[PDB]
Structures are given as structure tokens and as C-alpha cells.
Amino acid sequence: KLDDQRLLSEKGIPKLRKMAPRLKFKGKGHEFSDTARLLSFYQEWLDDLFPKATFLDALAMVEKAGHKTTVRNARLKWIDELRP
Amino acid sequence: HHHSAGLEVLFQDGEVNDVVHPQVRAHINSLVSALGGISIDDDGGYKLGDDALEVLRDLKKWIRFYDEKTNRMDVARCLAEANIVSTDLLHILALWTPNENSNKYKARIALACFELMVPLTWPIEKDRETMTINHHRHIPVLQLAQLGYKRAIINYDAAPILSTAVRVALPAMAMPIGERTARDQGIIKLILYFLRNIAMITPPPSQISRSALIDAFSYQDIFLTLLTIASNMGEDFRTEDVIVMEIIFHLVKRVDPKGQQLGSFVSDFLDSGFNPLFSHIRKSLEREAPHVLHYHQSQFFYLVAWFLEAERARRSSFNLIASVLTQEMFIALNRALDRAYGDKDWRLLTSAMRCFTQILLTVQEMFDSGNDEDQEIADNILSRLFYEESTHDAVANIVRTYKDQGFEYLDACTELAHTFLRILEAYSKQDEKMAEKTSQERKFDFKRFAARFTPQGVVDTFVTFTKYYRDLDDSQLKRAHRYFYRVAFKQEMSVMLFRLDIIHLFYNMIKGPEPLDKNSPMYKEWEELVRQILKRCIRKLEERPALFTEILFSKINSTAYYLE
């Protein structure tokens, strides 16, 4: 799909492996403030990917795109980086 | 503006045409006037018409041969505007007093009133092939007219109409089933359908109309009549089993099974007319009877579920509901579950799932019951249920596959999924080497069974149910709480629960736009729950950096095990 091509283009996903440990915004004592910083981090990324879209409506479009055969092969690349 | 506007006057009667056939309106009005009228003399009463019996028979002919045969609704609308079922027919039935039941003429005119009242108060279904442009025009008026009929019948000061209805069928009800003719069996059907019709009438989408119905039913001894037909469902009765069931179904409509207004009836019904009535309906559905209809199947499952909850509010004897706990019922509902899913019938499945939930809640209360025979039967039912994989794989697939099926269906499947896990968990626990081999083997089988509720499909269905937290009650919140609590306490590490959309909901549920009310008893349990899930969420991101990219939830059970 042309609308789901934003994930295929590899512009958003390489920033999810580079910007996530970069912020280091983690506190073990707090659950709410840490998850609020996490939600604000993804809300920023979703607005840059495609603006003028509802937050809840955007998240559901990402998971539906993930089920695709082309996307599944690309996702299996990220899990291999963990293995020694 | 200083002076009045001339357009303030409205529009105006024979000179202006109506939606009905102009000659029908004249003919129907010739009949409604000829049947009688109120006496001009003070305390005179109601003057019955001279040819009242024949005009009533002529009005019945106008319904069957003009409205029904030609697919029209003109005579129906004419009688609605005349409001005879509220202004004329009620006064005629008032004349036939309990001491005057011997009057043949007064009993025949009373029957002719119900032979007219039944088709007029009959429920209408908009979605039909037979329906034309004519039907669709009149239906909104007739539906409102039917509410006006019910109101007048329930609140009639002069005479008890519902008690008068029972008296019409009563002599043909006394004679044996073999001795009853086709005419005599028709009077029982007509009177039973009249009681169902008035109980059916509700405004299309007030609680006083629901209360007044129960109050009129008990006072005019209709609940006593319903009990006598239901308790003798074997001998003297047959076919009427579904008609009586429908009356009680429209009575228990949006009624709580515990601490109700009809508390006097519920105890008497379970003691006399539960097993003979519900065993007959079960046998009627199995043999594929001609009198039974498709909608009667889902109504049956609703009433079984309703009366099982009503039984646990009293729990005088768990033997009074023995007919619905038989293995014959189990085979029947399991075949009904497979058939309803295939035919894509969700309303039938909703009632079947809710019925099955109440059966499982009953066997659990029979396991802790004081009766020695009750614990014996509860354990032999649970023994089969713990190993019957045919039932297991079917229930698990329903909760896994959910898409635009409605909240009523969602509340029914999550009710069954939560109870099935909870009841089997109790069985999973309860010379030394021989006894342990058979006792500890059930713990292996339960972890295999609980693994059916772990996939993404079952998770998402419970997540979408949790979304309605603002409207969910204390018991409804317990189901969602105990499911997610079962995910972390499964050693699963809630890998399935880790998804942006799922994490979003849990946060704003406690701290966000909808605070779920801090004073609620379920809030404190949920606040402790969400914090425990989010604690493992932050920890798993540090443990594995792949979780940041695999937060999509599009994963399966094999990739989730890699993460934990």
C-alpha cells in the first residue's frame, strides 16, 4: 500500500533503533511518568511519519502493516542483532 | 412588529383525504359505532350493541380478508384511530362478570373481543419481504397505538381484563388433551398469545410500564395460571411449551434474578414448573418440532441462564434444576455452539454462551454444597468437562475470533472464558505414590488448556472489553482484572500485553482523562495491577532492545517465548 509505504521506506524504523537508547529516559521507581515519556516519544514519531491523524487510529494502522509478508522479513532482521 | 401575522392560523373531517382507503374508514367506523356505546343516563354504564356479536365477527373478517390477504394495513390503522381496544372492547369485557361466566352470549362476545385484540396487539417486524410502501407508512402509528392498548389493558379500573382472558380459555383448559378439539386448543393458544403480546409491547429504541406489568400479573392470578400450565407440561399440555416460555421471557426482560418484585413466583416456578417445562422445550428442539421457531432456541437459553442465577439466590435445593444439568443438555448446546458460529448467528450464540456460563457456576456451587449427592454429580460433570477437548477448542476459538459482533456478545464470551478457566482451576488441585499420580497429572492438563487463551486473538478481545471501563460494573471489571492478572501469573511475563495501544489504555485508565473514580473498590486493585505490568514493561526494554521495534504485537507464541 501507498499509505503503509512509510514503514517500507525505512525512515521511521531506523530511528526506533537509534533514538530509543539515545534518550535514556528511564526511572525504575516511577511507572506513570516513565510510560508518559514513552507515549510522548512515540506520539512525536507518529506526527513526523504522518500528521493530521488520531493517536489511537495511527497505532492500529502500524500493527495491521506488521502482518504483511514484506514487513515480517524486515522485522526478523532487528531480532538477529540481539544474538551473539 | 405591532399587528398580528395572518399565517398564525393552522390547517384543518370528510373534505380532506386520509392515508387509508376512504371507504375502509367509513366501513370500519360503521362497525365501531354499531358494537355499542356509553349510556347517556348517569350511572347507566355501557350499552352493548344489538348485533354486537356479528359486527365483531365482521371486524375479524376485515382483518383476515382485506388486510392480510391483500397485504394492506388500512383496517389496522382505522381501529387504531377509533381506539376500540382501549375505549370499546374493554367495556364489553367488563360486562362478563365472574358470576356471569355461565352466559353463553356474553362468553362468545368476550372471545370475539380477544379474537380481535390478539391480531391488533401482535408484534410487528419491519424487515419482511411481504411488507410494502403501505405497511411502512402505518407501522410507526400502529406501534405507538399498541403502547396505548397495553397501558389501557394494564390500568383498567372497572374490570380485570387479564383475569377475564384466563376465564375464556379456563373451561377448554380443564378438559383432557385427548378430549380437546382443534377449536378448544385454539382458544388456549389465542389466550396464551394475548398474554405474550401485552408482555412483548415496549417503546421502540420507561421502567414504570415494566413494574405495572408484574403487579397486574400477580394480582389477576396470571403467574398462578402460568405455573399450572408449566407444572403439567407432560400430561394435559403439549405445543403450548414455547408459547408459555415466551410469556415468561418477556416478563424476565431486563429483570434481576436476585431480590425481585416477582420473588413470590420465582420460588414457586423452580419448585413446580422448571424441570417439566424446560425438559419438554429441550425435547421439542431436538426432535425439530413444527410448532418451534428459530428465535425460541435463543429465548430458551436466556431463561435457563436467568433461572439458574435466580436459583443460587435461594439455593433451597440444587435438585429442582436437575433437567438443565443432564448430559443431554450438554450435547445439545455444544451442537448449538458449532451451528450458530457457522451460520454466523451471534444472538443465538450470545444466549448459548451466557447459559453455559450459568451451568458452570452451578456445578461449582454444587461442589461446595452440603448435599452428599450434589457433590457426587458436580464432580462427575466436572470430570468429563476437564478432559473433553471438543468443548475446549470450540470455546477458545470464539474469544480468539472477534470482529464487529457487539458488546452483548463481547460480555458473554469474556464471561464464559473467565469462568471456564476459574472452575477448572479448582478441579486442577482437588498409597501416597498411587494417589499423587492421578492428583498431580491434572496440573499438566490445565497449563495446556490455559495456553489456548494466551494467543494475540484472545488478548485483543479482552483489551477491547477493557476499553468500556467507564461503563463496566464491579463484576465486569473483575473479569478483565483477573484475566490480565492471570497473564503475569502464568509465568508468561505479559509479553503479549506489551503493545503501544494496550499500554496507552492502562495508563489513562488510572491517570488521564477518565480517572475510573478513585473511590471505586476496583480502582485500587487496577492501580496495583497496571503498575506491576508497567514495572515489567520498563525492565523488558532494558533487557532486550528489540522490544522497541517489536511493540507492534503482530508477533506469535514462538517469537514471544524468545523475548521472555
Residue numbers in the entry:
A (entry chain B): 69 to 152
B (entry chain A): -13 to -2, 3 to 195, 204 to 428, 441 to 574
Lines quoted from the article behind this entry:
The Tof1–Csm3 fork protection complex has a central role in the replisome—it promotes the progression of DNA replication forks and protects them when they stall, while also enabling cohesion establishment and checkpoint responses. Additionally it has an important role in protecting stalled forks and enabling their restart, coupling the replicative helicases and polymerases, promoting fork progression, mediating the S phase checkpoint and maintaining genome stability at CAG repeats. The mammalian orthologue of Tof1–Csm3 is the Timeless–Tipin complex, which has similar functions and additionally regulates the fork in response to oxidative stress. The structure reveals that, instead of containing distinct domains, the entire complex forms an extended alpha-helical repeat protein.
Here, I present the crystal structure of the Tof1–Csm3 complex from Chaetomium thermophilum at 3.1 Å resolution. The only construct of the complex resulting in diffracting crystals was Tof1(1–728)ΔL1,2,3–Csm3(48–157). Here, three predicted disordered loops were deleted from Tof1: L1 (256–363), L2 (420–434), L3 (558–585). However, in contrast to this domain, the helical bundle of Csm3 is flattened such that it no longer has a hydrophobic core and thus does not appear to be an independently folded structure and rather acts as a cap on the C-terminus of Tof1. The interface between the two is largely hydrophobic with some salt bridges, and consists of a large percentage of Csm3, showing why both proteins are required to stabilize each other. α25 and α26 from Arm-8 plus the following helix α27 contain all the interaction sites for Csm3. In our structure, the purification tag of a symmetry copy occupies this cleft. Furthermore, this interaction occurs in all three copies in the asymmetric unit despite the lack of symmetry in the packing, which suggests the cleft has a very high propensity for peptide binding.
